[PDB]
Coordinates of C-alpha atoms in Angstrom, one line a residue:
Chain A
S2 CA 71.2 105.8 -64.4
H3 CA 73.8 103.5 -63.0
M4 CA 76.4 103.8 -60.2
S5 CA 79.9 104.4 -61.3
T6 CA 82.5 101.6 -61.1
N7 CA 86.2 102.2 -60.4
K8 CA 86.9 98.6 -61.5
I9 CA 89.4 98.8 -64.3
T10 CA 89.2 95.9 -66.7
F11 CA 92.4 94.1 -67.6
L12 CA 92.1 91.4 -70.2
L13 CA 94.9 88.8 -70.6
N14 CA 96.3 87.9 -74.0
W15 CA 95.6 84.2 -73.2
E16 CA 94.1 81.9 -70.7
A17 CA 95.9 82.2 -67.3
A18 CA 99.5 81.1 -67.8
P19 CA 102.9 81.2 -65.9
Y20 CA 104.0 84.5 -67.4
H21 CA 100.9 86.3 -66.2
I22 CA 102.4 86.1 -62.6
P23 CA 103.2 89.8 -62.3
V24 CA 99.6 90.8 -62.9
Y25 CA 98.0 88.3 -60.5
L26 CA 100.8 88.8 -57.9
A27 CA 100.2 92.5 -57.9
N28 CA 96.6 91.8 -57.0
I29 CA 97.3 89.0 -54.6
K30 CA 99.9 90.9 -52.6
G31 CA 97.7 93.9 -52.4
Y32 CA 99.9 96.1 -54.5
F33 CA 97.0 97.4 -56.6
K34 CA 95.1 98.1 -53.4
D35 CA 98.1 100.0 -52.1
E36 CA 97.8 102.3 -55.1
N37 CA 94.0 102.6 -54.5
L38 CA 93.3 100.6 -57.7
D39 CA 90.7 98.0 -58.2
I40 CA 91.7 95.7 -61.1
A41 CA 89.2 93.3 -62.6
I42 CA 91.4 90.7 -64.2
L43 CA 89.7 89.0 -67.1
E44 CA 90.7 86.0 -69.2
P45 CA 89.8 85.6 -72.9
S46 CA 88.3 82.4 -74.2
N47 CA 89.6 83.4 -77.6
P48 CA 92.8 85.4 -77.9
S49 CA 91.6 86.9 -81.2
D50 CA 88.9 88.9 -79.3
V51 CA 91.5 90.8 -77.2
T52 CA 92.7 93.7 -79.3
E53 CA 89.3 94.7 -80.7
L54 CA 87.9 94.7 -77.1
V55 CA 90.7 96.9 -75.7
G56 CA 90.9 99.0 -78.8
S57 CA 87.2 99.8 -78.9
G58 CA 87.2 100.6 -75.2
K59 CA 85.0 97.7 -74.3
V60 CA 87.9 96.7 -72.1
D61 CA 90.3 99.3 -70.6
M62 CA 93.6 97.5 -70.7
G63 CA 95.3 94.1 -71.4
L64 CA 98.1 92.1 -72.9
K65 CA 99.0 91.2 -76.5
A66 CA 102.2 90.5 -78.5
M67 CA 103.9 93.3 -80.4
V68 CA 102.8 92.3 -84.0
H69 CA 99.1 92.2 -82.8
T70 CA 99.4 95.6 -81.0
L71 CA 100.8 97.2 -84.2
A72 CA 98.1 95.7 -86.4
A73 CA 95.3 96.5 -84.0
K74 CA 95.7 100.3 -84.5
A75 CA 96.5 99.9 -88.2
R76 CA 93.1 98.2 -88.3
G77 CA 91.4 101.1 -86.6
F78 CA 91.4 99.9 -83.0
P79 CA 93.5 102.5 -81.1
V80 CA 95.5 100.6 -78.5
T81 CA 98.9 101.7 -77.2
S82 CA 101.7 99.7 -75.6
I83 CA 102.5 101.2 -72.2
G84 CA 105.0 98.6 -71.2
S85 CA 106.7 95.2 -71.7
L86 CA 106.0 92.0 -69.9
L87 CA 107.8 89.1 -71.7
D88 CA 110.7 90.1 -73.9
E89 CA 111.4 88.3 -77.2
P90 CA 110.4 84.8 -76.2
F91 CA 111.7 82.3 -78.8
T92 CA 108.8 81.7 -81.3
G93 CA 108.5 79.2 -84.1
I94 CA 107.0 76.2 -85.8
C95 CA 107.1 73.4 -83.2
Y96 CA 107.2 69.9 -84.4
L97 CA 108.0 66.3 -83.4
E98 CA 111.0 64.5 -84.7
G99 CA 110.0 61.5 -86.9
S100 CA 107.1 63.3 -88.5
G101 CA 109.1 63.9 -91.6
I102 CA 109.5 67.6 -90.8
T103 CA 113.1 68.8 -90.6
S104 CA 115.0 72.0 -90.2
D105 CA 114.4 72.6 -94.0
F106 CA 111.3 74.8 -94.4
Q107 CA 110.6 72.7 -97.6
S108 CA 109.8 69.7 -95.4
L109 CA 106.6 71.5 -94.5
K110 CA 105.2 70.9 -98.0
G111 CA 101.7 69.5 -97.8
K112 CA 101.8 69.5 -93.9
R113 CA 99.0 70.6 -91.6
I114 CA 100.4 73.6 -89.9
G115 CA 98.5 74.9 -86.8
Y116 CA 98.3 78.6 -85.9
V117 CA 96.6 80.4 -83.1
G118 CA 94.3 83.1 -84.5
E119 CA 95.2 84.9 -87.7
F120 CA 98.6 86.5 -87.8
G121 CA 100.5 83.2 -87.6
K122 CA 99.0 82.1 -90.9
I123 CA 99.9 85.4 -92.6
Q124 CA 103.5 84.9 -91.4
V125 CA 103.8 81.4 -92.7
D126 CA 102.1 82.3 -96.1
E127 CA 104.7 85.1 -96.5
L128 CA 107.6 82.8 -95.7
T129 CA 106.6 80.3 -98.4
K130 CA 107.7 82.7 -101.2
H131 CA 111.1 82.8 -99.6
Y132 CA 111.6 79.1 -100.0
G133 CA 110.2 78.4 -103.5
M134 CA 106.7 77.8 -102.2
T135 CA 103.2 79.3 -102.1
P136 CA 100.5 79.5 -99.5
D137 CA 98.9 76.5 -101.2
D138 CA 101.9 74.3 -100.5
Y139 CA 100.6 73.6 -97.0
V140 CA 97.3 73.5 -95.0
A141 CA 97.0 76.1 -92.3
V142 CA 94.7 75.0 -89.4
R143 CA 93.4 77.5 -86.9
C144 CA 93.9 76.0 -83.4
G145 CA 93.4 78.8 -80.8
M146 CA 95.2 78.0 -77.6
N147 CA 95.5 74.2 -78.3
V148 CA 98.3 74.1 -80.9
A149 CA 100.6 71.9 -78.8
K150 CA 97.7 69.6 -77.7
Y151 CA 96.7 69.0 -81.3
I152 CA 100.3 68.3 -82.3
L153 CA 100.4 65.7 -79.6
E154 CA 97.0 64.3 -80.7
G155 CA 98.1 64.0 -84.3
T156 CA 95.4 66.3 -85.8
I157 CA 98.0 68.7 -87.1
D158 CA 101.6 67.9 -88.1
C159 CA 103.3 70.9 -86.4
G160 CA 102.3 74.4 -85.2
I161 CA 103.3 77.9 -84.3
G162 CA 104.2 78.4 -80.6
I163 CA 106.5 79.9 -78.0
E164 CA 109.4 77.9 -76.7
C165 CA 108.6 78.4 -73.0
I166 CA 105.0 77.3 -73.3
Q167 CA 104.3 75.1 -76.3
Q168 CA 107.7 73.5 -76.6
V169 CA 107.7 72.7 -72.9
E170 CA 104.3 71.0 -73.3
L171 CA 105.7 68.8 -76.1
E172 CA 108.8 68.1 -74.1
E173 CA 107.0 67.0 -71.0
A174 CA 104.5 65.0 -73.0
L175 CA 107.3 63.1 -74.8
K176 CA 108.9 62.3 -71.4
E177 CA 105.6 60.9 -70.0
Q178 CA 105.5 58.6 -73.0
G179 CA 109.0 57.4 -72.4
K180 CA 110.2 59.3 -75.5
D181 CA 113.2 61.6 -75.8
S182 CA 112.2 65.1 -75.0
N183 CA 114.7 66.4 -77.5
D184 CA 112.3 65.1 -80.2
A185 CA 110.5 68.4 -79.5
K186 CA 111.9 70.9 -82.0
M187 CA 111.3 74.2 -83.5
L188 CA 111.9 76.1 -86.8
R189 CA 112.4 79.6 -85.4
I190 CA 110.3 82.1 -87.3
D191 CA 112.9 84.9 -86.8
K192 CA 115.5 82.6 -88.4
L193 CA 113.1 81.7 -91.3
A194 CA 112.2 85.4 -91.9
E195 CA 115.8 86.4 -91.1
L196 CA 114.9 89.0 -88.5
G197 CA 117.5 88.6 -85.6
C198 CA 115.0 88.5 -82.7
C199 CA 111.5 87.1 -82.0
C200 CA 110.6 90.7 -80.9
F201 CA 107.4 90.2 -82.9
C202 CA 106.2 88.1 -80.0
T203 CA 107.2 90.3 -77.1
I204 CA 104.1 90.3 -74.9
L205 CA 103.2 93.9 -74.0
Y206 CA 101.0 95.8 -71.6
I207 CA 98.4 97.6 -73.7
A208 CA 95.7 100.1 -73.1
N209 CA 92.9 101.8 -75.0
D210 CA 94.0 105.4 -76.1
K211 CA 91.0 107.2 -74.6
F212 CA 91.4 105.3 -71.3
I213 CA 95.0 106.5 -71.3
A214 CA 94.2 110.1 -72.1
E215 CA 91.4 110.1 -69.4
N216 CA 93.2 108.1 -66.7
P217 CA 96.9 109.1 -66.9
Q218 CA 97.4 108.6 -63.1
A219 CA 95.7 105.2 -63.0
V220 CA 97.9 104.0 -65.8
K221 CA 101.1 105.2 -64.0
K222 CA 99.9 103.8 -60.7
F223 CA 99.0 100.5 -62.4
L224 CA 102.6 100.2 -63.7
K225 CA 104.1 101.0 -60.3
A226 CA 102.2 98.1 -58.9
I227 CA 103.2 95.8 -61.7
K228 CA 106.8 96.9 -61.3
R229 CA 106.7 96.1 -57.6
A230 CA 105.3 92.6 -58.2
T231 CA 107.8 92.1 -61.0
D232 CA 110.7 93.1 -58.7
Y233 CA 109.4 90.8 -56.0
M234 CA 108.8 87.8 -58.3
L235 CA 112.3 88.1 -59.8
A236 CA 114.0 88.3 -56.4
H237 CA 111.8 85.5 -54.9
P238 CA 110.7 83.3 -57.8
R239 CA 109.9 80.1 -55.7
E240 CA 107.9 82.0 -53.2
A241 CA 106.1 84.2 -55.7
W242 CA 105.3 81.1 -57.8
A243 CA 103.8 79.3 -54.8
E244 CA 101.7 82.4 -54.1
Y245 CA 100.5 82.5 -57.6
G246 CA 99.5 78.8 -57.6
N247 CA 97.7 79.1 -54.2
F248 CA 95.4 81.5 -55.9
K249 CA 95.2 79.8 -59.3
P250 CA 95.7 76.1 -58.6
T251 CA 96.3 75.2 -62.3
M252 CA 99.7 76.8 -61.8
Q253 CA 100.6 74.3 -59.1
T254 CA 101.2 71.5 -61.6
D255 CA 104.7 70.2 -62.5
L256 CA 104.0 71.2 -66.1
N257 CA 103.3 74.9 -65.3
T258 CA 106.2 74.9 -62.9
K259 CA 108.5 73.8 -65.8
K260 CA 107.0 76.5 -68.0
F261 CA 107.6 79.2 -65.4
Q262 CA 111.2 78.2 -65.0
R263 CA 111.5 78.6 -68.8
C264 CA 109.6 81.9 -68.9
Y265 CA 111.8 83.3 -66.1
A266 CA 114.7 84.5 -68.2
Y267 CA 112.4 86.3 -70.6
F268 CA 110.6 88.6 -68.1
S269 CA 111.3 92.3 -68.7
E270 CA 112.8 93.6 -65.6
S271 CA 112.3 97.3 -66.4
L272 CA 108.9 97.0 -68.3
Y273 CA 110.4 99.4 -70.9
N274 CA 109.4 99.3 -74.5
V275 CA 112.6 98.5 -76.4
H276 CA 112.9 101.0 -79.3
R277 CA 115.0 98.9 -81.6
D278 CA 112.6 96.0 -81.2
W279 CA 109.6 98.1 -82.2
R280 CA 111.5 99.6 -85.2
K281 CA 112.4 96.1 -86.5
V282 CA 108.9 94.6 -86.1
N283 CA 107.3 97.7 -87.6
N284 CA 109.4 97.0 -90.7
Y285 CA 108.4 93.3 -90.5
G286 CA 104.7 94.3 -90.3
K287 CA 105.0 96.5 -93.5
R288 CA 106.8 93.6 -95.2
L289 CA 103.8 91.4 -94.2
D290 CA 101.4 94.0 -95.7
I291 CA 99.5 94.3 -92.4
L292 CA 100.9 97.8 -91.6
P293 CA 100.8 100.8 -94.0
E294 CA 104.1 102.0 -95.5
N295 CA 104.5 105.0 -93.2
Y296 CA 103.0 103.5 -90.0
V297 CA 104.2 104.8 -86.7
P298 CA 104.7 102.3 -83.8
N299 CA 102.0 102.6 -81.2
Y300 CA 103.9 102.6 -77.8
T301 CA 105.1 104.9 -75.0
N302 CA 107.4 104.8 -72.0
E303 CA 106.0 108.0 -70.4
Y304 CA 103.9 106.2 -67.8
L305 CA 107.0 104.4 -66.4
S306 CA 108.3 106.2 -63.4
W307 CA 111.9 104.8 -62.9
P308 CA 115.0 105.3 -65.1
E309 CA 115.2 103.7 -68.5
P310 CA 118.0 101.1 -68.5
Chain B
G1 CA 88.6 108.7 -89.5
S2 CA 90.3 105.4 -88.8
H3 CA 88.7 104.5 -85.4
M4 CA 86.6 101.4 -86.2
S5 CA 83.7 100.1 -84.2
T6 CA 83.4 96.5 -83.0
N7 CA 80.5 94.0 -83.4
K8 CA 81.7 91.9 -80.5
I9 CA 79.4 91.5 -77.6
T10 CA 81.2 90.7 -74.3
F11 CA 79.8 87.9 -72.3
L12 CA 81.3 87.4 -68.8
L13 CA 81.0 84.1 -66.9
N14 CA 80.1 84.0 -63.2
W15 CA 83.1 81.8 -62.5
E16 CA 86.2 80.3 -64.1
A17 CA 85.2 78.0 -66.9
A18 CA 83.3 75.1 -65.4
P19 CA 81.1 72.2 -66.6
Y20 CA 77.8 74.0 -66.4
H21 CA 79.1 76.7 -68.8
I22 CA 78.8 74.2 -71.7
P23 CA 75.8 75.8 -73.4
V24 CA 77.6 79.1 -73.8
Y25 CA 80.8 77.6 -75.2
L26 CA 78.9 75.0 -77.3
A27 CA 76.8 77.7 -79.0
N28 CA 80.0 79.3 -80.1
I29 CA 81.9 76.1 -81.0
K30 CA 79.0 74.7 -83.1
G31 CA 78.6 78.1 -84.8
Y32 CA 75.2 78.9 -83.4
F33 CA 76.1 82.5 -82.6
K34 CA 77.6 82.9 -86.1
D35 CA 74.4 81.5 -87.6
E36 CA 72.6 84.3 -85.7
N37 CA 75.1 86.9 -87.0
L38 CA 76.4 87.4 -83.5
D39 CA 80.1 87.7 -82.5
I40 CA 80.2 86.8 -78.8
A41 CA 83.4 87.5 -76.9
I42 CA 83.3 85.0 -74.0
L43 CA 85.3 86.3 -71.0
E44 CA 86.2 84.6 -67.7
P45 CA 86.6 86.4 -64.4
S46 CA 89.5 85.8 -62.2
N47 CA 87.3 87.1 -59.3
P48 CA 83.5 86.3 -59.4
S49 CA 82.9 89.4 -57.2
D50 CA 84.0 91.6 -60.2
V51 CA 81.1 90.4 -62.4
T52 CA 77.9 92.2 -61.5
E53 CA 79.6 95.6 -61.2
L54 CA 81.1 95.1 -64.6
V55 CA 77.8 94.1 -66.2
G56 CA 75.8 96.6 -64.2
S57 CA 78.0 99.6 -65.0
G58 CA 77.8 98.8 -68.7
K59 CA 81.5 98.0 -68.9
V60 CA 80.5 94.5 -69.9
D61 CA 77.4 93.7 -72.0
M62 CA 76.1 90.4 -70.7
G63 CA 77.1 87.5 -68.4
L64 CA 76.1 85.1 -65.7
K65 CA 75.4 85.4 -62.0
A66 CA 73.3 83.7 -59.3
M67 CA 69.9 85.1 -58.3
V68 CA 70.9 86.7 -55.0
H69 CA 73.8 88.5 -56.7
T70 CA 71.6 89.6 -59.5
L71 CA 68.9 91.0 -57.2
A72 CA 71.6 92.7 -55.1
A73 CA 73.4 94.2 -58.1
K74 CA 70.5 96.3 -59.2
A75 CA 69.5 97.1 -55.6
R76 CA 72.9 98.6 -55.3
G77 CA 72.6 100.8 -58.4
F78 CA 74.2 98.4 -60.9
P79 CA 71.2 97.8 -63.2
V80 CA 71.2 94.3 -64.6
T81 CA 68.3 92.0 -65.5
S82 CA 68.0 88.3 -65.6
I83 CA 67.0 87.3 -69.2
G84 CA 66.9 83.6 -68.7
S85 CA 68.0 80.7 -66.5
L86 CA 71.1 78.4 -66.9
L87 CA 71.4 76.3 -63.8
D88 CA 68.2 75.8 -61.8
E89 CA 68.3 75.5 -57.9
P90 CA 71.5 73.6 -57.5
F91 CA 71.9 72.3 -53.9
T92 CA 74.0 74.9 -52.0
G93 CA 75.3 74.6 -48.5
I94 CA 78.2 74.6 -46.0
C95 CA 80.4 71.8 -47.1
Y96 CA 82.5 69.9 -44.6
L97 CA 84.2 66.5 -44.1
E98 CA 82.9 63.9 -41.7
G99 CA 85.2 63.6 -38.6
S100 CA 86.2 67.2 -38.3
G101 CA 83.7 68.0 -35.5
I102 CA 81.1 69.5 -37.8
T103 CA 77.7 67.8 -37.9
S104 CA 74.2 68.4 -39.2
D105 CA 73.7 70.7 -36.2
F106 CA 74.4 74.3 -37.1
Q107 CA 75.8 74.8 -33.5
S108 CA 78.8 72.5 -34.3
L109 CA 79.9 75.5 -36.4
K110 CA 80.9 77.5 -33.3
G111 CA 84.4 78.8 -33.4
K112 CA 85.0 77.3 -36.9
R113 CA 86.7 78.8 -39.9
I114 CA 83.9 79.0 -42.6
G115 CA 85.0 79.7 -46.1
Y116 CA 82.9 81.8 -48.4
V117 CA 83.4 82.9 -52.0
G118 CA 83.0 86.7 -52.3
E119 CA 80.6 88.6 -50.1
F120 CA 77.1 87.3 -49.8
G121 CA 77.9 83.9 -48.4
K122 CA 79.1 85.6 -45.2
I123 CA 76.0 87.8 -45.1
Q124 CA 73.9 84.6 -45.3
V125 CA 75.8 82.7 -42.7
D126 CA 75.8 85.8 -40.4
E127 CA 72.0 86.1 -40.6
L128 CA 71.7 82.3 -39.9
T129 CA 73.5 82.5 -36.6
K130 CA 70.7 84.3 -34.7
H131 CA 68.3 81.5 -35.6
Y132 CA 70.6 79.0 -33.9
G133 CA 71.5 80.8 -30.6
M134 CA 74.6 82.3 -32.1
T135 CA 76.0 85.6 -33.4
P136 CA 78.3 86.5 -36.3
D137 CA 81.1 86.6 -33.8
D138 CA 80.7 82.9 -33.0
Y139 CA 82.5 81.8 -36.2
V140 CA 85.4 83.1 -38.3
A141 CA 84.4 83.8 -42.0
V142 CA 87.2 83.4 -44.5
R143 CA 87.0 84.9 -48.0
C144 CA 88.2 82.1 -50.4
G145 CA 87.2 83.0 -53.9
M146 CA 86.8 80.0 -56.2
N147 CA 89.0 77.8 -53.9
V148 CA 86.7 76.9 -51.0
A149 CA 86.8 73.1 -51.5
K150 CA 90.5 73.3 -52.1
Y151 CA 91.1 75.0 -48.8
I152 CA 88.8 72.6 -46.9
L153 CA 91.0 69.8 -48.3
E154 CA 94.2 71.7 -47.4
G155 CA 92.8 72.3 -43.9
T156 CA 93.2 76.1 -43.9
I157 CA 89.4 76.4 -43.3
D158 CA 87.2 73.9 -41.5
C159 CA 84.3 74.0 -44.0
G160 CA 82.8 76.4 -46.5
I161 CA 80.0 77.4 -48.9
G162 CA 79.7 75.6 -52.1
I163 CA 77.3 73.9 -54.6
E164 CA 76.8 70.1 -54.5
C165 CA 77.7 69.5 -58.2
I166 CA 81.0 71.4 -58.1
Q167 CA 82.5 71.8 -54.6
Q168 CA 81.1 68.6 -53.0
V169 CA 82.1 66.5 -56.0
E170 CA 85.6 67.9 -55.5
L171 CA 85.6 66.8 -51.9
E172 CA 84.3 63.4 -52.8
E173 CA 86.9 62.8 -55.4
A174 CA 89.8 63.9 -53.2
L175 CA 88.5 61.6 -50.4
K176 CA 88.8 58.7 -52.8
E177 CA 92.3 59.9 -53.7
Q178 CA 93.1 59.5 -50.0
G179 CA 91.5 56.1 -49.7
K180 CA 88.6 57.5 -47.6
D181 CA 84.9 57.0 -47.9
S182 CA 83.6 59.7 -50.3
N183 CA 80.3 59.8 -48.3
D184 CA 82.4 61.8 -45.7
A185 CA 81.8 64.7 -48.0
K186 CA 78.7 66.3 -46.5
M187 CA 76.9 69.7 -46.4
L188 CA 74.6 71.7 -44.2
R189 CA 72.0 72.8 -46.9
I190 CA 71.6 76.6 -46.6
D191 CA 68.0 76.5 -48.0
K192 CA 67.0 74.1 -45.2
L193 CA 68.8 76.2 -42.6
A194 CA 67.2 79.4 -43.9
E195 CA 63.7 77.8 -44.1
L196 CA 63.5 78.4 -47.9
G197 CA 62.7 75.0 -49.3
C198 CA 64.7 75.5 -52.5
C199 CA 68.2 76.7 -53.4
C200 CA 66.8 79.1 -56.0
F201 CA 68.9 81.7 -54.3
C202 CA 71.8 80.1 -56.2
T203 CA 70.0 79.5 -59.5
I204 CA 72.6 80.7 -62.0
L205 CA 71.2 83.2 -64.5
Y206 CA 71.8 84.8 -67.9
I207 CA 72.1 88.5 -67.1
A208 CA 72.4 91.6 -69.2
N209 CA 73.1 95.3 -68.6
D210 CA 69.7 97.2 -68.7
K211 CA 70.9 99.8 -71.2
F212 CA 72.3 97.0 -73.5
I213 CA 68.9 95.3 -73.3
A214 CA 66.9 98.5 -74.2
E215 CA 69.3 99.4 -77.0
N216 CA 69.8 95.9 -78.5
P217 CA 66.6 93.9 -78.0
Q218 CA 67.1 91.8 -81.2
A219 CA 70.7 90.8 -80.3
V220 CA 69.4 89.6 -76.9
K221 CA 66.6 87.5 -78.5
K222 CA 69.1 86.0 -81.0
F223 CA 71.6 85.3 -78.2
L224 CA 69.0 83.4 -76.3
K225 CA 67.9 81.5 -79.4
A226 CA 71.4 80.4 -80.0
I227 CA 71.8 79.4 -76.3
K228 CA 68.5 77.4 -76.5
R229 CA 69.8 75.7 -79.6
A230 CA 73.0 74.7 -77.8
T231 CA 71.1 73.7 -74.7
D232 CA 68.7 71.4 -76.6
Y233 CA 71.7 69.7 -78.4
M234 CA 73.6 69.2 -75.1
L235 CA 70.7 67.8 -73.2
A236 CA 69.9 65.4 -76.1
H237 CA 73.6 64.5 -76.8
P238 CA 75.4 64.9 -73.4
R239 CA 78.4 62.6 -74.1
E240 CA 79.1 64.0 -77.6
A241 CA 78.5 67.6 -76.4
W242 CA 80.8 67.2 -73.4
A243 CA 83.5 65.8 -75.7
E244 CA 83.2 68.8 -78.0
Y245 CA 83.5 71.2 -75.0
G246 CA 86.6 69.4 -73.7
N247 CA 88.2 69.4 -77.1
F248 CA 88.0 73.2 -76.9
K249 CA 88.7 73.6 -73.1
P250 CA 91.1 70.7 -72.2
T251 CA 90.5 71.2 -68.5
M252 CA 87.0 69.9 -69.1
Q253 CA 88.5 66.6 -70.3
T254 CA 89.5 65.5 -66.7
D255 CA 87.7 62.7 -64.8
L256 CA 86.9 65.3 -62.1
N257 CA 85.2 67.7 -64.5
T258 CA 83.4 64.9 -66.2
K259 CA 81.9 63.8 -62.8
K260 CA 81.0 67.4 -62.1
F261 CA 79.2 67.6 -65.5
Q262 CA 77.2 64.4 -64.8
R263 CA 76.1 66.0 -61.5
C264 CA 75.3 69.4 -63.1
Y265 CA 73.2 67.7 -65.8
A266 CA 70.1 67.3 -63.7
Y267 CA 70.1 71.0 -62.9
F268 CA 70.2 72.6 -66.3
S269 CA 67.1 74.6 -67.1
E270 CA 65.6 73.1 -70.3
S271 CA 63.4 76.1 -71.3
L272 CA 65.6 78.9 -69.8
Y273 CA 62.5 80.4 -68.2
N274 CA 62.8 82.5 -65.1
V275 CA 60.5 80.9 -62.5
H276 CA 58.3 83.6 -61.0
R277 CA 57.7 81.9 -57.7
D278 CA 61.4 81.4 -57.1
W279 CA 62.1 85.0 -57.7
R280 CA 59.4 86.0 -55.2
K281 CA 60.8 83.8 -52.5
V282 CA 64.4 85.0 -53.0
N283 CA 63.3 88.6 -53.2
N284 CA 61.8 88.3 -49.7
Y285 CA 64.8 86.4 -48.5
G286 CA 67.1 89.2 -49.7
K287 CA 64.9 91.8 -48.0
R288 CA 65.2 89.6 -44.8
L289 CA 69.0 89.7 -45.2
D290 CA 68.7 93.5 -45.6
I291 CA 70.5 93.4 -48.9
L292 CA 67.3 94.5 -50.7
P293 CA 65.1 97.4 -49.8
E294 CA 61.5 96.6 -48.6
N295 CA 59.8 97.7 -51.8
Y296 CA 62.3 96.0 -54.1
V297 CA 61.0 94.5 -57.4
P298 CA 62.7 91.3 -58.8
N299 CA 65.0 92.1 -61.8
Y300 CA 64.1 89.6 -64.5
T301 CA 62.2 89.2 -67.7
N302 CA 61.1 86.2 -69.9
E303 CA 60.1 88.4 -72.8
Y304 CA 63.3 87.8 -74.9
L305 CA 62.7 84.0 -74.8
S306 CA 61.2 83.0 -78.2
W307 CA 59.3 79.7 -77.4
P308 CA 56.5 79.1 -75.0
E309 CA 56.9 78.4 -71.2
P310 CA 56.2 74.7 -70.9

């Protein structure tokens, strides 16, 4: 046979990024150790791997956005959100002024539109019918984690991204070229779809259902440690950020520092799943035909051990 | 029921993404895994010391680790097997900068802060001391993870364990950044110090969980075929291959990483074969370090490789 391992696998939604600070900081400051937890932090090379891995139990826990978490279980990969990390970050179609793309959705006709994995394309395809268009009126291009990079390189004309990550990259890159950073703009997806929030892109703590049912204390203790790191980071951002970069030097760049400052306001303080946000995205998912008509949102706040705000 | 299964096979690197990982990524990028009907989920560790336990316990299917770690994993009850070789015998040693009081003499290490990655580097340095009129208390070992060269440059350690084509290139480039002579980046070779002859103890290997191997022999063979296909292309088209890799992983587009790749290039195993003699020497070394029991048998196999040993 084999020896047992207490290492709990935690798979990020993305390559290591500024908003992952509470996870790494919880490890770095020994908060996991203090809860007698050993967390193996893993980074995906492809974000589209993440929900199948967690859902199948090949990975115990991780992060993903809300729309992905919903779809994972509708697709037969039983994950559950046990908490929130990054709340409603502004999400949209990022573009550069002077490329012919304007605030009119119709300006996207015939454009190459980058998306990350799969769901971004589904979303844009659905939007088209709301603006006298069809999914053939543009070319969707799968870009993984390089949407902003490929916009800058000219290989796509615009692309789906988050304001505090992708738009910051564009802004900083414009500046470096001696261009106006305000040329970096975004058609908000929540505006286009008329939603009211970008809650569909709230980044959540998720876990496999069986892992939850079999390690209820580990889950609760994991969230205590995250909460402690989150409290610390929010009260001492500069010092926490420096701690994070000392461990992951990529975070020590000016570019990631700018991103972190933009991420800062979006961090969930309480880690709570916001009920109204889940209801609204659930309905959005059904509208997108990726969730069945009577689908129940897959989240819980029961492993959080402090008052709901 | 609604619970669906996955076809994804998890593959965990030994380290954050680095130039020598090109054959793994390239096999995916150029569609070689898909051509073999394999869906490989490439994962990157934040902590290299997590890897062998994750593969050994079966939590992760396959991955990479160096020989010493691979032998040690199964000796400790985490059953993995090397199924092929990625990076052959890369020069490994205690890296330092000229002028800091450290010299080719092991005894200059007295009272110094010596960085190591995870666990075994300290074991190795500790054992070395007694051959040089020293004890493990005659230096201060500092656990550094993947940031040994960084911390040498930042001065929070005096020297540390690293491989020539990664850590030493890092010191060389930073020295030029400072207007210094890059030749000031030196190492005390650990193979020389330990009387080994080769740095096969740091040969980086393709490894797999033993149960995964027994239950999926065809997937393993196919994985290695796709790896071999990527490896041939990369060795025959290094510039084009490197550019493909960097287009996917932008960090690989830096001048520093390009110089690391050029230095890694000579070390890539061309046939992926485990070298039997190397395993024998490293087995005995690990027994000597007391990390392997006296009757221990090397945990590797070449039987999933689909072309002859040249």
